[model samples]
Target: MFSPSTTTLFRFVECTEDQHALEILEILNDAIINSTALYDYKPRSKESMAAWFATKRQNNFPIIGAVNEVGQLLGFASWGSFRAFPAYKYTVEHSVYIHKDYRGLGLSKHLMNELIKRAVESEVHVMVGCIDATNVASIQLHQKLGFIHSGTIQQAGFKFGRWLDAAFYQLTLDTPLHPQDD
Candidate 1:
């Protein structure tokens, strides 16, 4: 288990029904609409999100959230198969998002630490993060968490009437590699 944090407790959401997925979908939809965080042009339907949640559940993946005493969903983080091929079974890609109001309070870092701890315990080999090149804050945070920058995929997306760049970073959780060796 990861070292527990006093400010934000990280726990797996036991029963994330379609409703909970919808709530999270709403947050993501808002980001897609208002910010460059998500480069989608349209919002996802509850049905689509429900399907995603079902897949995660079927795969035994975690859909964790950060909530307050009042049971309000502040933000969420999740992971699923990074690739479907058998060789990629031990690798996964994950993301963490804290509500705008909750930024800089260590919530995302705490959440990421928890996720990494859990992944390591599960014997996951690698954790990948594909971040938008414009999102310097997230890139910096991933670096701080020991994710090494792999490289950038140039003009990989089209949003806001222009091409967008994406940066991919990866960290081998609990690898034999020595940290900071590269």
Candidate 2:
């Protein structure tokens, strides 16, 4: 429903098997291998990607994607539980990734905006973005989107031959109603 840039037109769509599963995995795997976007050192397999997609479907979580005019997957944004405990039900952690060639086109911004929209609609009280401290671009993007710089963990992750600090950004949303207990 939004355009990330003037030159390219993109349509927002939900993640799908035939349309997005493999492509999404490819994008993520590239990040995992070559960038600090993800801390993983191993590339994800098709089987794992399939299971990931299945879990998204089972959880009813939104996997918002932006595809180019010709239907090429440019980027995606999604969220999952921030913590496993029941007390954390109102909090969610989110991720956004774009194609290497598609960087600086506003795709990440658009994707994040969509994710925030979905989170607000779902009554989520807080959204978190856990990023590497070295990823200034992501940290800046999250700040521009109204996320506050919470705290950073020193030497929290080991990757690319060294320890990397983890920066946490958080955005609080308005809760429409008080959360009830079962």
Candidate 3:
């Protein structure tokens, strides 16, 4: 729950059209070009993003966004399978991205809270955040959200002409200890 603060109330919504999809892609692409938040080298095309949307829809995953009162997409959070194997079905990998202008406004916490809520409601056992080792703010945010630093891999990725380390932060959602087999 977001308390009253600097900004007025924010409206949250699920992905509904190409305009929102394109806005998300642009925000992510800005990160890809300027920062190590994303490991990909090229900007995502509309076609690729459309395919990603299809997969998220097909899997029934949550792709939630935060909008301003005027309906501008400020940020988004979502999750998908942590691994492909059925044995890992209870685990999920999540992502959160906010527009550059809206950084440091505490929107991420609100977005993450909602995402975690959805994950728990959907019976997800664990939610993992794969963060760039150099991203201090992201690391701290995860820690504040009860995510523990489970592990880190040195030089696990290459981007921006340098090797990047990756850190895994896990947030165990409140769920049944033993899931039903049926």
**Over the stretch 1-182, how does candidate 1's per-residue lDDT look in tens digits?**
54435464434453387447666887888888877777678998878778888898899888777776556677888788877777687789998867776678877887788788878877777898888888888998899999999899999988888888988899887652433311
For residues 1-182, write the lDDT of model 2, one tens digit per residue.
Answer: 54545488888999887789888988999999998888789999999988888878898888999988899999999998788898888899999999988999899999999999999899999999999998888989999999999999999999889998999999999874888764
lDDT of 1 at 132: 84
TM-score of 1: 0.84
Q: Candidate 2 — which pairs collide? A: none
Worst 10 residues of 1 by lDDT: 173-182
Worst window of 10 by summed lDDT in candidate 2: 1-10
- Give model 3 RMSD, 1 decimal: 2.7
C-alpha positional error of residue 162 in candidate 1 after TM-score superposition, expressed in Å: 1.3
What are the RMSD figures for all models against the true structure?
Answer: 6.0, 2.7, 2.7
CA displacement after TM-score superposition, residue 114 of candidate 1 (Å): 1.0
Most accurate candidate by lDDT: 2
Candidate 1 wrong stretches, greater than 4 Å:
1-15, 175-182
